[PDB]
């Protein structure tokens, strides 16, 4: 069967949610950490060594363990995401697809 391997991500309106990617604990050989806005392929966060790494606001954070945070999570802040976190060789040492949702409990 051909399916995805994404993370069923959930939230609630007026909330703050995260993006837990790491299936591992790399450290010694890693370089780049990336997160995109899959909906329209729109850069939200990135790491490219200590010469150029960025995160516009808290609304989208890039962390050490490699998680991506997001503050304020209403219907508007619910989107689709993906993480590509590469090593020094420039390989995609791990890749994954995510999807923020909103719930009604
Ligand atoms: C990857 O990394 C991520 C982070 O690096 C990580 O996410 C983090 O996860 C942890 C938990 O795993 C989260 O921590 C929780 O925090 C709750 C309280 O939070 C509020 O207070 C914090 C501390 O306050 C600072 O600021 C005050 C200023 O007024 C000072 O007075 C304080 O002294 C203190 O200062 C310190 O920090 C400063 C930096 O800000 C620093 O300068 C200073 O020197 C000093 O060190 C605030 O930081 C925090 O603010 C954040 O969050 C709010 C939203 O709430 C935002 O608005 C802010 O903008 C900001 O982002 C808050 O105000 C705790 O209650 C909670 O405790 C529970 O969990 C622990 C651990 O398991 C238990 O021991 C404990 O008993 C509690 O358990 C209870 O609940 C659970 C349910 O969860 C339940 O099961 C259990 O039975 C029990 O009932 C916890 O500690 C942290 O917030 C996350 N983010 C960050 C940035 O750390 C992520 O998980 C990682 N990913 C992976 C995959 O591993």
CATH of 1-105 among 3.30.70.1730, 2.60.40.10, 3.40.50.1860, 3.40.605.10: 2.60.40.10
Kindly report the number of other CB atoms within 10 A of residue 83's CB atom. Answer: 24
**How many A from CA of 70 to the centre of ligand 1?**
15
Residue 11's CB: how many other CB atoms inside 10 A? 19
Residue boundaries of the structural domains of the chain: 1-105
Q: Do strands 95-100 and 80-84 pair parallel, antiparallel, or not at all (unpaired)?
A: antiparallel
Rounded Cα distance, 7 and 103, in Å: 15
Pocket-forming residues, ligand 1, beta carbon under 6 Å: 16, 20, 22, 63, 65, 67
Burial class of 13 by CB neighbour count within 10 A (0 to 12, 13 to 18, 19+): middle
Phi/psi at 104 (nearest 5 deg)? -145, 80
> Method used for this model?
NMR
Pocket test for ligand 1, best of 60, 62, 65, 73 (most atoms within 8 A of CB): 65
For 7, phi then psi, to 5°, come to -105, 110
* Rg of the chain taking only CA atoms, in angstroms: 14
Phi, psi dihedral angles at 30 (to 5 degrees): -90, 160
How far, in Å, CA of 99 to CA of 7, rounded?
7
């Amino acid at each position: 069967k051909e399916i995805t391997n994404a993370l069923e991500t959930w939230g609630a309106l007026g909330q703050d949610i995260n993006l837990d990617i790491p299936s591992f604990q790399m450290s010694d050989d890693i370089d780049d950490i990336k997160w995109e806005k899959t909906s329209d392929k729109k850069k939200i966060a990135q790491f490219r060594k200590e010469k150029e790494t960025f995160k516009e606001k808290d609304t989208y954070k890039l962390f050490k363990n490699g998680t991506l945070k997001i503050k304020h999570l209403k219907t508007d802040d619910q989107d689709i995401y993906k993480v590509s976190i590469y090593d020094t060789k420039g390989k995609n040492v791990l890749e994954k697809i995510f999807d923020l949702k909103i719930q009604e409990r």
